[PDB]
Amino acid sequence: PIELLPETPSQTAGPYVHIGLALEAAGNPTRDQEIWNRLAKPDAPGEHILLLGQVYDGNGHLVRDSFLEVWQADANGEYQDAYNLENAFNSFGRTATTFDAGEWTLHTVKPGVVNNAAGVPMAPHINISLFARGINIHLHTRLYFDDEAQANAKCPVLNLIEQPQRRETLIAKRCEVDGKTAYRFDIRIQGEGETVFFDF
Amino acid sequence: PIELLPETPSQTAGPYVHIGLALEAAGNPTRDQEIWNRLAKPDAPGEHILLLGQVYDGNGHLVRDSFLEVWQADANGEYQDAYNLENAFNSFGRTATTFDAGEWTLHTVKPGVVNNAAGVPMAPHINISLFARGINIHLHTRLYFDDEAQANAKCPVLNLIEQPQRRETLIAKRCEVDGKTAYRFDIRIQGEGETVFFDF
Amino acid sequence: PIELLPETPSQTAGPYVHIGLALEAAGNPTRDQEIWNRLAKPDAPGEHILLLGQVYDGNGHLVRDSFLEVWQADANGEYQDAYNLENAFNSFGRTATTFDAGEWTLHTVKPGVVNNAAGVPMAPHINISLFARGINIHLHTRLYFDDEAQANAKCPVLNLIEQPQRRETLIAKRCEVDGKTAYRFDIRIQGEGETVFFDF
Amino acid sequence: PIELLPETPSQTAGPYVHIGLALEAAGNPTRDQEIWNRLAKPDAPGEHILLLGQVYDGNGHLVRDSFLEVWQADANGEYQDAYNLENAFNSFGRTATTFDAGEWTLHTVKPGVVNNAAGVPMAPHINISLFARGINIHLHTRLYFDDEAQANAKCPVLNLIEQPQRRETLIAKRCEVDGKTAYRFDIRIQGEGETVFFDF
Amino acid sequence: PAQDNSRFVIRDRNWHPKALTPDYKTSIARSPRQALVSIPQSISETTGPNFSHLGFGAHDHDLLLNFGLPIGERIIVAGRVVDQYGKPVPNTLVEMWQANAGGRYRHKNDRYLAPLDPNFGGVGRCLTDSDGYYSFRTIKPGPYPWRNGPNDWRPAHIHFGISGPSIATKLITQLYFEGDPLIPMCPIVKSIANPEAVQQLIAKLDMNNANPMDCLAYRFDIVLRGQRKTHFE
Amino acid sequence: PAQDNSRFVIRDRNWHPKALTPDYKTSIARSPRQALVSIPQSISETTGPNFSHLGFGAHDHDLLLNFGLPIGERIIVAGRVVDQYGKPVPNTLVEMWQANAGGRYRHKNDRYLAPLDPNFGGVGRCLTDSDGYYSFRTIKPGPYPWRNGPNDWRPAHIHFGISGPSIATKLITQLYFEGDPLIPMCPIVKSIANPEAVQQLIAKLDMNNANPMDCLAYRFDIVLRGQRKTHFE
Amino acid sequence: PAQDNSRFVIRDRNWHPKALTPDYKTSIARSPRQALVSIPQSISETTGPNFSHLGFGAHDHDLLLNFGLPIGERIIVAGRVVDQYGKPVPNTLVEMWQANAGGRYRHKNDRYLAPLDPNFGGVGRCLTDSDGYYSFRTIKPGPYPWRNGPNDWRPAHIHFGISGPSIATKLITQLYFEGDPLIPMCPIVKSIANPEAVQQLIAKLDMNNANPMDCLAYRFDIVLRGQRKTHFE
Ligand SMILES: O=C(O)c1ccc(O)[n+]([O-])c1
Ligand SMILES: O=C(O)c1ccc(O)[n+]([O-])c1
């Protein structure tokens, strides 16, 4: 059969990922521009929300050295690839869990619907990649919203998960933080309530 | 790199281990001198205690053919290596679980404090080696005492265990047997509440 | 390590190099445009000088079949790579030793100062490449002038030559020919007073 | 034939040898006890002398990074192998050439006569080992004295050099420095007047 | 905005290290037990950020000046980023981090006894050029002991992060140094089943890129998922 | 004028023939006894002449017409000039000279008893094209006896001279012909220690470039020192 | 005083590097042109100094303490000194010197641009024990550019000096590190004609002798000329 050049093999980010990708967290001086966790400026169109969560290992212990990357559509279900700090909204962000509490947060807006390759609309979602010590190759997951039940029910992606039970592991629980709309998304890497991870 | 001679590979002790290492248990006549479960004679200095416990497999079933070896310092935190049945105290002992109930017992004294290589004191502890059928290479653990909480919190060994909850797995629970100070130390080879095992 | 394609290996020019590179000397008809020993036209800016010299072998015998190539800056210390017979000055030329007397000659201007990679000025010099029968790979040398003693003392290149006595092998001796400013530069390939050759 | 383990191959001492064996010279602080160029204390028996010389390369240029080691008998023709800074005399010493002038010196006494393996007396001599950048494996030589002509004429060692003219290269020239008996011993590594180097 | 016009060659998950690789202790509790759920590529996965407009500092890629001079072996780390088809990946973001010459990281959590270097930070970033080329200037890191087995030492390495054209292509990996004897012994390295794949992570000494009398150079090419256009979709 | 923007890969002096190769008798008295002094590259060494404007005659490269027809095997000698990186070297000067079909050279000093050919001069020059290609039309030269050992014969060869982008890249070499049994016996050839280096001087029969019922063709590619941009200098 | 009781196996001058090795430029003018003169062993040659009473400092063998902490890779360098007969060489002087982590020597004449390390001197000495064992604690040296060819780099190495029982055994050499890619490209290494001889200069990674969470170890054994008693003289 035809064989292409082989992709460079992945390796764990390690415990010190911060020094390279989350300068503040490493407890180091930052540069002029840094890719961080505030995707939308207060003047960005759409519903502003606060996202937060913890990450658990197979023992139910918090993963305090995790690093996440996010990719989402704006409010109009549009992907803004030209990254720029000046932008009112950027489709890409980065976050990390506290070496203490071990919670991560992101400041953004609820993404609008986009359609799949077949033209069927997917429910509003946020694409996440998880990195950390002990993770050889990063994990892909998607965040869904509990207040989008009707849409969620129809999701061509969500509908691919054989067992309905597992689909729930993907739905973020709406709440409020300091009177602001917040959504909680806990990631269970292994065991009870293991979060669905994807391959693509 | 430099390669030395390889160490002889380990093999399970198998189910009839008792015939060689626990004569009585095999239900065979003993020899004049046997290494058994009484580390101290009534006239040995220090606080006389009784140690007892069960061993569980990954299914929560008793392991009734286990064999254990113990190493500990005397009441003065001294290691007594010259093994002698005449001695008032021997730092080394042997025990096994009953083919019935499946409980082991040891008759010794509460060990004194020994320092690590860096000169920092370790909380009183008993070094344990576990052997049996199904175990290819013996399991190393340590037995600490619940009534030594202060020492425990500062143990350079206990402290190496990343998760605090795991540390608990190593602490024996003080009780009394026939009005005698006893400590119960259950071993969980696998699963829920799995005891910490070491490498050194 | 990384390995590139290897460079085509050098071979001696041989005794008949003239037929290919110095038509006149081969005693053959020349083409309309030949690359020769007259770098500057009479109307060229700078101090017009004549260069001459002989080439000696390890026995002290004249090498009557040598071929030389020269590269030098103009009077302003500028390298003029756009070779044209129409130019008043060309940075490049060729010359050869007579089958008789065994002396070569060049008609040029005294070159201006050029700075090395580090911004340090080099004393006025002419880059020379020697070719001939018996020479497997061409010899690189530099002609410096005796009347630039002050500049010469500070040349970062001349200064790389470990032994001061060897530096003198690179200095042409100012004389006059037919009332014209000339410099004599003898090359000693091997032995007593061997000329410094460079690798770069 | 019988093959033994091969000897570890020699490598040049390099330009910075001083850092390891001639601390002062490197321009670094010395340790409490250093092996140096004063073999004899002023109160040592025998004829006190000062030794000095230069080392030349094949071009007749000074070797200014040369390192030397000496081994000689005491005034009674005795080898004192137990090296001690307290001794009035040590058979072993070290010296090096000035990065400036390029001259080495030694403070010792004239060695007495020692016999060869066959019982034949050898003329008074000092054994020398020369090390340095560009010297892959150290050179061995002997220093003889011009005022011991009679002895020299009969030295079994000197007599092994086929060419009488080559023997002269090993004879130090007596002089005086500040009213003290001195001997000059220059070393020519290569060329005209090359010094006899030995293999043993 | 971005658009769905590309498809990316499915990753070979037998080439990359698996999730559970017992000798690397932490993977035990940090690897899923359920199978990954395969999903078709959509715009969500086939697009990603372009950092063409990120405001990069002048010394962003020069660890020798971005934090006196650091102590340690001066070197250049350069190479190219191509896809599986052999096409260059221009204007892509490459980030790196490493420990100093002694194996010490400039991180709070690093308690190794080798000292920190006052002139050294250990972070760099570079956007590939039109030809997919990148370069960094740094000092060669030292091996680092870690709590895995009782005497485990990570071979000298530099951590890398590459964005590529989509989130489907983003990758994190490590660069090792040619001939380092610790390579064969490391359990993280060994997380990779094929020895051929291991070779892909080894930077080669590149005497051709070296600055004489100044610094050595290492060549490290990177291959991301091959990109193709959709057809008969 | 010329600018100091490039660096050239340092020469491999064990690849090229050494200076002292005793079997080639002339080398003995014409080889330096001192070591070469290495020097950093400067504008002086990294620049060189550009001959794009030299006024070439129409048959400069055709030895068949540039001097009746010469007698001998009519061949085209063509190829490409590239650097070590494989980059083509456009508009570079390629000069060649050789003996006639009989091994006689049109030079006064040639006393060989093989006669001159009234129609043959034996000199050509060609400026490489946009792609690094050059071509000459000539006749295959004949081996030539020479006063070295008592029965020394040079294999059939064409002398070549190549300018390149700088004086640092300038080279003089010789082309040999595929299968020539004289090759391995030649002391000049053997000046080169590596058999693989020798291979590089052998032109290959190129039936694809030949003109049927007219002339054959040989292929000879030339590789000049690799050229790179300066970095972190 | 010393006595003539031993004979030393004759050195193999084809094993050791030769005096003239042209690629090592300086050897050209510093190599004798005449043949060495062989002489029979006498008391002069078969005796040497014994350094048993030299008053060594407490940290003479510890480069981490003998000059804060030096920056670099902490390693122990240990081995044994035996004769060709395989017999241990007890109470013998072993001296060493080397550059810092960045390849800079603490020497006046060293002008390399890599900086000096405030806490590193680079010299050590150790008297072998009863069993011929020696050991040093130091940091691994960096490669160093040197003025030989235009782009020559010495592999990381440690200079060693060993006394032995007599001046006949005294030796100076260098230690190299396992797997260093610069090894095979070095003109000084290449002064050794036999690749098997080169192997003896390579120190091997010694995980067994390492201090977990602290430092690595390298093993380097040295063989001095074989010593035998006299017979039938
Ligand atoms: O625990 C890990 O995964 C780890 C520790 C150190 C290090 O350098 N890297 O790369 C990884
Ligand atoms: O179940 C076992 O592990 C077993 C059973 C029999 C036997 O002889 N040994 O050695 C081992």
Ligand SMILES: O=C(O)c1ccc(O)[n+]([O-])c1
């Ligand atoms: O002496 C020489 O170097 C020589 C003689 C004849 C010839 O054809 N080539 O090429 C070289």
Ligand SMILES: O=C(O)c1ccc(O)[n+]([O-])c1
């Ligand atoms: O020129 C030399 O011989 C030389 C230069 C540097 C170095 O490190 N060593 O060992 C030797």
Ligand SMILES: [Fe+3]
């Ligand atoms: Fe790391």
Ligand SMILES: [Fe+3]
């Ligand atoms: Fe059995």
Ligand SMILES: [Fe+3]
């Ligand atoms: Fe010819």
Ligand SMILES: [Fe+3]
């Ligand atoms: Fe050195």
